[PDB]
Amino acid sequence: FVNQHLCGSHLVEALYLVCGERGFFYTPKA
């Protein structure tokens, strides 16, 4: 589910699953 174009909620969900209890940061404008 990681090796594709991930946008919006789809990208956020991937970070959620991959990072787990570590959490993550989402910065659309970086």
Place this chain on the structure above:
Amino acid sequence: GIVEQCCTSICSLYQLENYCN
């Protein structure tokens, strides 16, 4: 940024983990 690397282009686990805390 993440959108450029994962949305406009193809993402990878290596790149995703760069955004974990």
